[PDB]
């Protein structure tokens, strides 16, 4: 399988900047979602989820084909709750119908990160919608009740090393777990809609207590009222992961550069960018444009 990126006929940077701004303005507007968290978090997760189905072995899955839009993928249990971000995007797609789905799902994630004060994430256009039959089966997204070895093993399927994994997990600082979605409940910290290194800080500074939740699952609960998944907790259990956590806890900038690179990589896995493809775009945030 080869998926060559193909620029949407006749579109340039400026056209994308507009999709961006449209997402951004809508984020600003619908701020009541999930009790004032806003849609930022769910969009980052949608973008990660449409991309985590990838398999470096056979090149199936990944964000290229916009398969999330099909039933099999859309109804994946590990995708519970993502429908809210889908619906958020929907009007947007209507306003800009020439964008491919993979392009849009992924741009939402970038927009989300940047609008929430995170780092700038270079983004590339060119994903092409593929047919219903290219939809990966359910089962490729990771479980949360595991440990560091699982995570390690899991992420390898996506070509991510220790450093990327840890960088990538910092996104857990955003949003929260929801009992009805995954059988877990609670936020990871206090600033849940502004992008920071809080995740690492929390993991190193709170005094976590293992407990069972209402869904009969285990989670690490802290006095502050925060929770961590077994998989999140696992980053302190593993020696290699822990030194990285420590690095990010001390230097938000390193975290940001690392997250940036990894997130783009993550969204670009499985895609072949031809030689003449335009360079990756760096979008202006609403504020940078004075809107």
Binding site for K ion (CB under 5 A): 172, 175, 188
DSSP letters, 187-224, are ESSS-TTS--SHHHHHHHHS-EEEEE-TTS-EEEEETT
112 forms part of the interface with ligand HEM (CB under 6 A): no
**Which one, 146 or 284, has the nearer CB to K ion?**
146
158 forms part of the interface with ligand HEM (CB under 6 A): no
186 forms part of the interface with ligand HEM (CB under 6 A): no
Decide: residue 196, CB within 10 A, 0-12 exposed, 13-18 middle, 19+ buried.
buried
144 forms part of the interface with ligand HEM (CB under 6 A): yes
81 forms part of the interface with ligand HEM (CB under 6 A): yes
Across 231-253, b (16+ Cβ under 10 Å) vs e yields bbbbbbebeebbebbebbbeebe
* Residues in CB range of 234: below 8 A, 6 or more apart: 146, 147, 148, 150, 151, 241
Residue 27 CB, nearest approach to K ion (Å) = 17
Question: Out of ligand HEM, K ion, none, which partner does residue 188 contact, by CB within 5 to 8 A per kind?
Answer: K ion
**Which one, 128 or 235, has the nearer CB to K ion?**
235
- Cα 253 to the center of its chain, rounded Å: 19
152 forms part of the interface with ligand HEM (CB under 6 A): no
Binding interface with ligand HEM (CB under 6 A): 41-42, 44-45, 48, 81, 142, 144, 151, 168-169, 171-172, 174-178, 181-182, 184, 229, 231
């Amino acid at each position: 399988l080869v998926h060559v990126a193909s620029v949407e006929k006749g579109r340039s940077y400026e056209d994308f900047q507009k999709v961006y701004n449209a997402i951004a303005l809508k984020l600003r507007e619908d701020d009541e979602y999930d009790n004032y968290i806003g849609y930022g978090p769910v969009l980052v997760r949608l973008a990660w989820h449409i991309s985590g189905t990838w398999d470096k072995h056979d090149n199936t899955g990944g964000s290229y084909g916009g398969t999330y839009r099909f039933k099999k993928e859309f109804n994946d249990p590990s995708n519970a709750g993502l429908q809210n971000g889908f619906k958020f995007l929907e009007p947007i797609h209507k306003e800009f119908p020439w964008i491919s789905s993979g392009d849009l799902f992924s741009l939402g994630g970038v927009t989300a990160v940047q609008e929430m004060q995170g780092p700038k994430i270079p983004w590339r256009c060119g994903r092409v919608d593929t047919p219903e039959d290219t939809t990966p089966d359910n089962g490729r997204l990771p479980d949360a009740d595991k440990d560091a070895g699982y995570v390690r093993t899991f992420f390898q399927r996506l070509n991510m090393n220790d450093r990327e994994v840890v960088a990538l997990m910092g996104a857990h600082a955003l949003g929260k777990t929801h009992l009805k979605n995954s059988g877990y409940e609670g936020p990871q910290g206090a600033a849940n809609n502004v992008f920071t290194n809080e995740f690492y800080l929390n993991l190193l500074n709170e005094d976590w207590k293992l407990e069972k939740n209402d869904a009969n699952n285990e989670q690490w609960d802290s006095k502050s009222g925060y929770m961590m998944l077994p998989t999140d907790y696992s980053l302190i259990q593993d020696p290699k992961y822990l030194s990285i956590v420590k690095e990010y806890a001390n230097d938000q900038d390193k975290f940001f550069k690392d997250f940036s690179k990894a997130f783009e990589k993550l969204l670009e896995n499985g895609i072949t960018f031809p030689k003449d493809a335009p360079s990756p775009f760096i979008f202006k945030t609403l504020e940078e444009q004075g809107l």
